Symmetry: C3
Subunit: 632 residues, 3 copies
Amino acid sequence: QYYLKYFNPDIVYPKNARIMLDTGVVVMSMVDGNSTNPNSNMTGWVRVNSASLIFDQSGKTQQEINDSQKQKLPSLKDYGAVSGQDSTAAIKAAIAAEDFLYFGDIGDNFIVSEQIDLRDGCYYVSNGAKFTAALGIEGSQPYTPKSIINASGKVGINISGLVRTHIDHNIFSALGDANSKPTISGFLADAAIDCDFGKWESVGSVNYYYTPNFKEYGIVDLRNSIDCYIEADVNGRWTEETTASTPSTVGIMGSNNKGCYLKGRAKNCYWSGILWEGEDCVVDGPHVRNTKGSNLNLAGKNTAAYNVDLYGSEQGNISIGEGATQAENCNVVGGVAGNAKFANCHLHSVTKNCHVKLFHYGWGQTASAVSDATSGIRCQGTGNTIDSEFDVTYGGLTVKGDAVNVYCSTLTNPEATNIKVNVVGIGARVQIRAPYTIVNAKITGATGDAVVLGERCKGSIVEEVTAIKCGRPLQYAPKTTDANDYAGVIIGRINDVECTNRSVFYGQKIVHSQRKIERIYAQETAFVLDQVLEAIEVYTNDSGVTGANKLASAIRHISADSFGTSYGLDLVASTISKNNLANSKTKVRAGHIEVEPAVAGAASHIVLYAANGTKWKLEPTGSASAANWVAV
Amino acid sequence: QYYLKYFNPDIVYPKNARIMLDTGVVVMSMVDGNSTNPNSNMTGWVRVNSASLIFDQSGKTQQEINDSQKQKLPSLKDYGAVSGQDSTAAIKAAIAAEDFLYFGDIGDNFIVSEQIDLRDGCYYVSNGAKFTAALGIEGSQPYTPKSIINASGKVGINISGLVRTHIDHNIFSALGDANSKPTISGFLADAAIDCDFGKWESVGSVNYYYTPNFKEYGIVDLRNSIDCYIEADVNGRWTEETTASTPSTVGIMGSNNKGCYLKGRAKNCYWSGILWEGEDCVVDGPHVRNTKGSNLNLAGKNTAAYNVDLYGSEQGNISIGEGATQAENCNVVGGVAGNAKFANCHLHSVTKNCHVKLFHYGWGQTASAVSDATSGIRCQGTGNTIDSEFDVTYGGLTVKGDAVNVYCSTLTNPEATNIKVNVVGIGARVQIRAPYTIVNAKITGATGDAVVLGERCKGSIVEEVTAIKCGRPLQYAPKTTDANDYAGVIIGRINDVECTNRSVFYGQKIVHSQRKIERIYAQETAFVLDQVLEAIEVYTNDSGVTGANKLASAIRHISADSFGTSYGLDLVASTISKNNLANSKTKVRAGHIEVEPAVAGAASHIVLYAANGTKWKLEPTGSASAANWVAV
Amino acid sequence: QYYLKYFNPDIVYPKNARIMLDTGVVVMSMVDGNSTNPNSNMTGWVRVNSASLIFDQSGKTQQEINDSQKQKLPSLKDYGAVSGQDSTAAIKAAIAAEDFLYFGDIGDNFIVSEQIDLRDGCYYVSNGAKFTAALGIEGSQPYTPKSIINASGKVGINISGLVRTHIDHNIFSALGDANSKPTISGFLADAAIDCDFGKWESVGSVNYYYTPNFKEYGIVDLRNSIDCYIEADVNGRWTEETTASTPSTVGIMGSNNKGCYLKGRAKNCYWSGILWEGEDCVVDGPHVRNTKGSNLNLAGKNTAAYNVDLYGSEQGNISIGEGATQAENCNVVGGVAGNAKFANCHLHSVTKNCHVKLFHYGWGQTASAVSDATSGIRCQGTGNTIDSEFDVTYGGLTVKGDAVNVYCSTLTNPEATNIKVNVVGIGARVQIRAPYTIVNAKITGATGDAVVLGERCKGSIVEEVTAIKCGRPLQYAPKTTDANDYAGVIIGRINDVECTNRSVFYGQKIVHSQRKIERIYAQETAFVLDQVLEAIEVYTNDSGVTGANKLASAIRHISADSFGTSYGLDLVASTISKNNLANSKTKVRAGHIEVEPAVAGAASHIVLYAANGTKWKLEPTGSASAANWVAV
């Protein structure tokens, strides 16, 4: 008929005997004296439907095959995580169990009710696996900061690939009060050591304002960590939503780190796009768009942002040392910063030896009237170096305020001192109001002064200013009434090309030079009478002389002749006459000197001394007569 | 005997009853009243050889295990793609079905008959999987551009790993005509948004010349895309084959992109190695070898190539704005460019505010005679900055033409204006023929002039030129006949070390300086009679004076004494005598002046004025006699 | 009863007949005339427990499923490698068999007895798989260098992910003798071509000192290779152990390479952290800590280290060309170097055209007295460019020796020539003792001289030195006795701000300038009698004059008047009187000159010539009397 036998209570089964369970599944006896009921007791029985009873061609059991094949890539889904379900339990189970672990892929979205703690020395792979926050993640009251994925106090994690985080702030907005609120990061690692945190793409955080001891957290946050690496791509939803209160703060946030590397992209942040604070940290090509805070904040010590790509702030592109204890050798190493309401780069008073190199434009985008805040580079601090490249027309934005603005308020404990300035660009001013400032500039097309040095520039060296088709190359405008204000200020080489107004100086420099023979060759071919080959001209602004002629004194290398077949010197002097400075010359000539009269109708003379130290003039009579010594 | 039962037409099968199919496979009844013929009708039957009827140790079915294990890594080969077969159908099936997808490995080579379209938001992994083009890929007539893998109009692709492409142009060379041809890219993405395209290694393309509206495509091509990233390593087979016609064009081609990043390696390209055009695009360390076109072409706006590694072109290393509408702030940010037939870097007339920093050598490798094309840096455009580092001996190549060549043809709407030049190196010239040029140079070992400023240099500032063991530091050689030509040209500090010939100037600069006390200390220890401590010397090139002495006038700080126990001034004058300029001195001395005669046998004198403005000389008689006023 | 039938010797089995083996496993006949004993002979029998006799829902066999699922990710463990066992055989088996191959994960540690040779064109993936050396790896006598993983003479490897290596030197320390020892690298590739070697984390090597022809190997070593890429993170255990002899040498070692890229991290190395030698090689952000050798050694040709991060050496941060044939255009492209016993950067005599740009501090940390070795930058070679940024206070370390020290020992075949120096920083000296040196400096807070130029500076141009609150801006201190020593040395613009002592010069420069009108405008408002508007002052150091007044000669632009309502010139002369230089003036004035007496009680005069060339003085009598010509 058919094959069917149940267990018989009275029978002894030999080895290899097959029967059925009440379920229908077939059992074989492994023993010769089998009396055991396989429905109750599998002692000396095997189920023939077992994986361990299927054989591959190789000689491996199917069991052996499933075991080795699984152990290659242990997944969250192996632990019964479900995409579009709460997977919390399953996730934590997976982590606790598996040193190497696969999250899943781009089609996976695991819902998480509790903070996911990574484990020490583990390796995690991820193909685009998303994690989504749900209620309860904020954890226990007195609320302390949490994340979806956490590596707080973890050592030697590796993450290979892409992890995605989703926080909807609208779920959490009703929780806490005035004093205490949830803080929910995408990723947090506080006190992590030597971790590669792979790649993140994260939307949203939860960081509503609470009144005492408010702590901002990033979407992606690494705090108090050592030798950690992450890549992160965050969206803060600023300008993509309307919200009652400020939901989220900083995009990507690094704070009190040592030796930590970011590859960083931030948008739509209600505070700072990227903040990176600490010691020997690196921001590698940060890319920031449309942030309510500053695009990029650096502090700490020897923290460098390389090849920046910043656009669109309610504040500035770059703060150095904003709200910070320390900003020592915090550097920006090339890039582009555009469309800031205030400054491209604000180097705060805290800054020590910060180096900024930047292409920058469309600062001072504020509706608000011009201030120190509306600068390209706004510089305070101690011995900062600016390498400015700028253009005012760039990206069809209209600037407000100086290209560079370096300034103290007082010479007594100055807020800005020892700054080095290197500035090239088109169509705004460099303003300096700070001691010991070293200035190099190339400026094209400024309406006004290329460069001004105002008050409080004591001991500034202006090495070189080249100005093409400006209002004025340089003006020095010190505090006249105070010797201290302009003491030791050196204006070096000023280069004027088709500037409207001459440069304006103050003070007299002391210069020490090597002995020279200076040789001026004139190629020209032809020289008319009293033609200047080479001159130095000294002009006065004396009270006593009001009226257009102000030549005080001059030395002129002259063509003496209507042929240029003789040459001399013009030793120029001056005296007040008819409310003007009248000029006259001692003429140094081949075989003669000639002293010219002070004015028409005055005689000229030679003053000599007797041995008794009385003084005598030889002065012509208007006749061909004996010369006599006339007392003077 | 044995176990064998077929279906019986007359029998009712109880639950758990096992029989055989005619095939021999065993069936169990799931029902108590089974009358159904399992050969025809599996209603209430199960095949006992099913995966769903094998149980792992865990409690999972084998079916459940195969389902979860597959869904980890869905592959092309799961969809019945075969390596070394046409896999087109299978591929497209795989893509349509699977959000996450594995290509395969280095031993996989899938043959593709039709363009492979990726899908939006998908994640693709690849371990070296190769795709090979076959006939039909060119698609339908009127031929439009195709690729092996395509992401035209795709959003949010991720590619993890390495994809390899093979196009043999020899399959496609007979297709189209004069007017219409196939275009076959390795990879194309036209109008892609926010895609990471991982890593490519691609050989060959199909892009034969057709007569109207010819469109070049890359081996690897990203057109009209936003926020896309690729790495690509291409071979164009130029110099590895002989071909009737030009088969392929550009290696890696980026055109009208916004915010797109390349890591790029190109060789053996019949056009450009790498071209990258657009807005805010980045070329990160492009590595180009042996290209018939230019090694690297930049255009658009704020497109930067970082840390270039270019060698071996029939054209140049770098074109900026070749055949382009726009080349505004298109920058090269360090690297090395060598072995160009023409220029290392050609900044075309289109260029606005382009910055080039480069080590460069072995330009002008052409057999053809020296031209503007045979330059290190060939610069036209508006306000480009050159940072040149060069060496003519470098890599044992022999250069032709100037190190830097900045030039307009006319001052009226000049093709080059406002260029900034910073040049250091060994053993070639800097030539400037352009207005408003700012020059800084350090040149060693040039045969001729370190620097020349030719015609059309109006309003150029030459800040500093240091020349070691050149022919000449600087020559200024303007259009003499035109005041406009040399108007406002400033030659600053020229530094001559063991140059053969003195520097040659033209024009006279107007300089405004801060008031100085200048203090020249001479350490020497010993000074002979008429020894010059410090001098200024003015020389003439007057027509009227032909014959070697051309000192017009001088001021000399002099040791007056054969002991150096007295010091004075020499006020030097000159007059034509015996077809030479004869020199004579007013001697300013402690307690005297001394006017020397113009020539031997002439008397000296003092000219003074009477109050009636007649002039009188005191002139010695050759006796110890009364001095009289003598009319003059 | 039950289901059980053995093979019967007398029976013919029809097709589909099932019996048992003596083992109990069920067999079905595939043939109608089966007479074959399945216990001895499986001809026309199948085992029903076969994978090929289980069917997935899809229609695939379980066999077909195991085959395709395995071939996705072939592993070492598939080949029966065991973690914490000797896996050598299994590994080599895996490699020989599989073009694509998975090592395993972070929980895998395979013990290796013999060098593992990779294969040409293969692709390897690794999730943190560790390999550990055991005895026998050193291989056969005469000992030749070995590694755990080897790619010597391999082409076109790819490695994706992270491989980890462990060498315990304590296993191998008893082997060889005086002449011959094991050399055991983590990874070695000698003569590899176009390989991506992914990522390494490696501890330890074996490289004990043997007396003739000692060859240092890296922990991670690439020798004589072309177009190879690696990332490597090594620990040499220096300072983590005590050892009898030097066990290991170089961390990461690149030697005679062409076009090879490193991402490099080294610590605790008994020699060099990272060495990279060859042609067109790149060290991308090398990160070195706590090394007994130099942190970083470059040689060869066009080898560049970018954005260095070096701290803590018994030697220096950077050697260029240490123990090398060639060091031509070997560059350091930004970064930070700190805490070297000797120099931050030593550019050896071999160096040609090396460019160094660096922030540097805490050099000369040695207990040993100041030498040339205790410099920030120690520079020898031919035409090296230094861009120095320095700070002596930085990181609370106390420096010893010059910031920069550029030096030859002789002008005859000089060890240092043609060096370019650009130096900014705080609180140490720049020393130059080398010909043709170009100097630019900005120095703050040096105790002594900002800059000194010593002996052997022939044909040096010091373009600009800015000194703020130094001891002295510049001193030039040549070999006085030798004209050659200071020939052609140009000291340009020296800027002194509140320096203690004036700059000290030697020699007189020849300067060629463009013709100028120089216009000095004085803004001041008020001028007293004999007030200097602008002056040049020439001072002597003559033997003959000992005693404080050393003004030799001067030209002074003067306010002539107690109102500043007249202006002139002061032409200053001097003569020895009462063991001082006494000053006197020719006064150039509006309508007069005035010659002042040499000293009180001397008369002044005018010297003129007769036509017979005899000389005559007009000199006052002390009366209102006839002027006579007095012979002189």
